[PDB]
């Protein structure tokens, strides 16, 4: 649900030590960050471990590994979060593939609710 919209076009930007890009949540309402149980990120097919990932919602930036404490931080419906990936080398210009695979801890559903997307993004300057 909303899978084709997870990775936001034109959003890949360099930051110190890696890249940032925009991500939307594949769910029909806002959800507390603590129930984003998995968000597997790949850059150029390479996995970004959870310790190198941060999520920015509005004015709050949280390390992805600390999401358990973000029970009331809402990833609002349609809201673009800035996901920051610390990478082991600088990214050259031009296009790169960004993949996001979500598993959501939905309380009325017995197993993680899933959404997945990958897009070719150009490094916008």
């Amino acid at each position: 649900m909303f899978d084709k919209y997870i990775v936001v076009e034109d959003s890949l930007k360099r930051v110190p030590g890696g890249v940032q890009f925009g991500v939307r949540l594949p769910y029909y309402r806002g959800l507390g960050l603590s129930m984003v149980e998995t968000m597997d990120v790949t850059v150029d097919g390479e996995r970004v471990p959870e310790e190198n990932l941060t999520v920015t919602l509005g004015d709050r930036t949280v390390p992805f590994a600390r999401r358990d404490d973000e029970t009331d931080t809402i990833w609002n419906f349609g809201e673009i979060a800035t996901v920051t990936a610390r990478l082991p080398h600088e990214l050259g210009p031009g296009e790169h593939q960004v993949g996001v695979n979500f598993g959501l801890r939905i309380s009325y559903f017995p197993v993680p609710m899933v959404g997945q997307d990958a897009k070719t993004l150009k490094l916008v300057d």
Binding site: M1, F2, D3, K4, Y5, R24, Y28, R29, G30, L31, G32, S34, M35, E37, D68, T71, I74, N76, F77, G78, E79, R105, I106, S107, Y108
Partner: protein, 324 residues
């Protein structure tokens, strides 16, 4: 002539997600169809909930007056798994539920859509809070459940004991899934399902064959994983007896007029509106039928979504069947 037309704004989620329609855009479209009853999901279209301020609530009241619309129903959610490694305590659940009662009160609603999975024990414990705000609590009955499902039977036991007119039900028209929904079958084929096996599944759906039989049979005839998942939709979509509603009419506060696809004929292609609406009339129903479009999630991979058009057709269908 007492059945009223409404819309759950959940129907416009695709456009709202994409920032093509605002919250007020949705209400406006709704009034343009003469569907004046409004059902809303704060966690979907009101960022900042449960901390909305009086400026918001006063502005919503003024919006309702400007369009001639009525704030009917608030749809709560309950995130029992908010904390990793545990569920909310019952007291934490009550706190969350009271949030929604308070908000629905400030929004002017008369009924809350209580998630189908909410326990009778939670309904019982929050009842004094509902009473303080004179807020009806309608437990949603949705597929594959029905009014004779043991979960609903147990809810009925509790409401019979408590004796409160504020506890009741909101049937979802997906419990009247007369045919395997076409947009569902078509997306399954786009995902790689075997068309011959899909036809078997759709036929067996109409035949009312036991779900577990269809699943094992699709497995046995060599169905691929998509075919098997297609068969397993029979565990999640069901037909039920429309006259069963007559037994529970005093507790039917609201109806989710779920739909997936309105054709160019203003006909819904898989749900049992022509059987259910006469029963609601026979029973004296005086609540709302609230459009709840869900076709978006099935067609969005290959087609543009036009929720306003789909809801316009649905509202014309409702008006005809009600007898306006």
């Amino acid at each position: 002539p007492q059945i009223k037309r409404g819309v759950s704004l959940y129907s416009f989620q695709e456009e709202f997600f994409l920032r093509k329609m605002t919250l007020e855009d949705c209400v406006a479209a709704c009034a343009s169809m003469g569907a004046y009853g409004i059902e809303s999901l704060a966690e979907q279209m009101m960022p900042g909930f449960p901390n909305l301020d009086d400026a918001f609530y006063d502005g919503w009241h003024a919006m309702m007056a400007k369009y001639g619309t009525v704030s009917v129903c608030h749809d709560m959610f309950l995130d029992t798994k908010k904390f990793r490694g545990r569920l909310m305590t019952l007291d934490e659940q009550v706190e969350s539920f009271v949030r929604d009662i308070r908000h629905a009160s400030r929004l002017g609603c008369t009924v809350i859509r209580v998630l189908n999975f909410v326990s009778p024990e939670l309904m019982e414990k929050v009842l004094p809070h509902a009473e303080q705000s004179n807020m009806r609590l309608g437990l949603e009955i949705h597929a594959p459940m029905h009014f004779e499902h043991p979960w609903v039977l147990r809810h009925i036991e509790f409401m019979d004991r408590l004796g409160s007119p504020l506890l009741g039900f909101i049937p979802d028209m997906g419990i009247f899934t007369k045919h395997f929904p076409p947009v569902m079958a078509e997306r399954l084929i786009r995902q790689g399902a075997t068309p011959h096996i899909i036809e078997y599944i759709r036929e067996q759906y109409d035949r009312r064959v036991l779900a577990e039989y269809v699943v094992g049979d699709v497995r046995n005839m060599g169905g691929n994983p998509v075919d098997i998942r297609a068969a397993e939709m029979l565990r999640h979509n069901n037909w039920s007896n429309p006259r069963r509603l007559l037994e529970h009419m005093d507790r039917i506060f609201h109806v989710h007029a779920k739909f997936y696809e309105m054709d160019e004929q203003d006909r819904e292609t898989s749900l049992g509106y022509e059987e259910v609406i006469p029963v609601l009339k026979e029973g004296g129903y005086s609540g709302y039928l609230a459009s709840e479009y869900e076709g978006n999630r099935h067609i969005q991979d290959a087609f543009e979504v036009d929720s306003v058009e789909q809801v316009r057709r649905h509202q014309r269908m409702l008006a005809r069947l009600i007898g306006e």
